Amino acid sequence: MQIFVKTLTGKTITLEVEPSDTIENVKAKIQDKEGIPPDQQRLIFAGKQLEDGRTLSDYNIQKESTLHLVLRLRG
Amino acid sequence: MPEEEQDSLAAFSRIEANITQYDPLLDNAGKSACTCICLKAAEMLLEASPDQVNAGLIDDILVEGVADYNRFKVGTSVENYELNTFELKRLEFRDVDNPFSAEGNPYAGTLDSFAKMMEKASDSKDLPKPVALVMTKSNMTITIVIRPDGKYWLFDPHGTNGKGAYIESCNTDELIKKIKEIFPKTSYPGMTEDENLGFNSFEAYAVRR
Numbered sequence: 001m002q003i004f005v006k007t008l009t010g011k012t013i014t015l016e017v018e019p020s021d022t023i024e025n026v027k028a029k030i031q032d033k034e035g036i037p038p039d040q041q042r043l044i045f046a047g048k049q050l051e052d053g054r055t056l057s058d059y060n061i062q063k064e065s066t067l068h069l070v071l072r073l074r075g
Numbered sequence: 076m077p078e079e080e081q082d083s084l085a086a087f088s089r090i091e092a093n094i095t096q097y098d099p100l101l102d103n104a105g106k107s108a109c110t111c112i113c114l115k116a117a118e119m120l121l122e123a124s125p126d127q128v129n130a131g132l133i134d135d136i137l138v139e140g141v142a143d144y145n146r147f148k149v150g151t152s153v154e155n156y157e158l159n160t161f162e163l164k165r166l167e168f169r170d171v172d173n174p175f176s177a178e179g180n181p182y183a184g185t186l187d188s189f190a191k192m193m194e195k196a197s198d199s200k201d202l203p204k205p206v207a208l209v210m211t212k213s214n215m216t217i218t219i220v221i222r223p224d225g226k227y228w229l230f231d232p233h234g235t236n237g238k239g240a241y242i243e244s245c246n247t248d249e250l251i252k253k254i255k256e257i258f259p260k261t262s263y264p265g266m267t268e269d270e271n272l273g274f275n276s277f278e279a280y281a282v283r284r
């Protein structure tokens with residue numbers, strides 16, 4: 001199924017995922033497209049920052065949902 | 076005697092450190108000393124009067140901030156720093172009706188949303204005064220002290236051209252102008268979102284004493 005990720009700086013990316021995919025798997029797919037290390041990705045859905053060990057399903061993220069991505073800035 | 080006082084924010088709009096010897100450390104975005112020193116600046120400036128903010132006080136921010144940086148390296152947080160070390164307390168502050176925000180995360184935005192953030196921050200409904208914002212991008216940290224009159228002290232550990240460190244007294248329009256010069260819009264062809272986010276977004280933490 002397809003989901004979308006919108007970055008804070010305005011880009012919308014399309015990912016191919018399965019509900020069983022973990023958040024860490026999703027972050028790795030984002031890294032494959034934009035080079036962002038998973039440990040610095042804040043993925044937001046319905047106002048919660050998603051945890052690496054859970055699955056898209058655990059968060060009831062369905063097809064064509066849009067996640068929101070913020071980079072954890074190091075300074 | 077007045078003739079024996081250092082220049083301070085009680086009479087000037089910009090005050091500069093004398094000490095430059097820490098600049099290779101403060102300017103190194105591969106280290107987090109710049110953030111440690113911004114946290115020391117919030118600690119020290121939140122309860123200062125304008126006449127106390129002289130070159131000697133900024134020197135003390137650098138000297139004491141580097142000591143705490145070193146102490147942290149041997150052996151509630153902001154970028155992995157324990158705020159207790161700075162006698163600071165974190166206050167919740169985020170863009171609530173915005174899809175990039177989550178409870179407990181810092182305020183996330185871009186240059187286009189910086190003015191809105193400051194409007195919220197400067198509202199004593201949202202945060203008490205004085206309060207400081209510690210604001211980061213991928214390669215720089217600053218501190219914005221919101222003063223009792225609602226104007227600002229901008230502390231920049233990078234200094235002008237990477238040399239020394241300064242504090243500027245700013246109204247809102249001046250602060251926006253300065254942040255656009257320190258956090259400039261950055262672009263080049265092929266830039267990935269790792270760098271777009273790193274250069275063109277910010278996170279801001281609210282702290283008080």
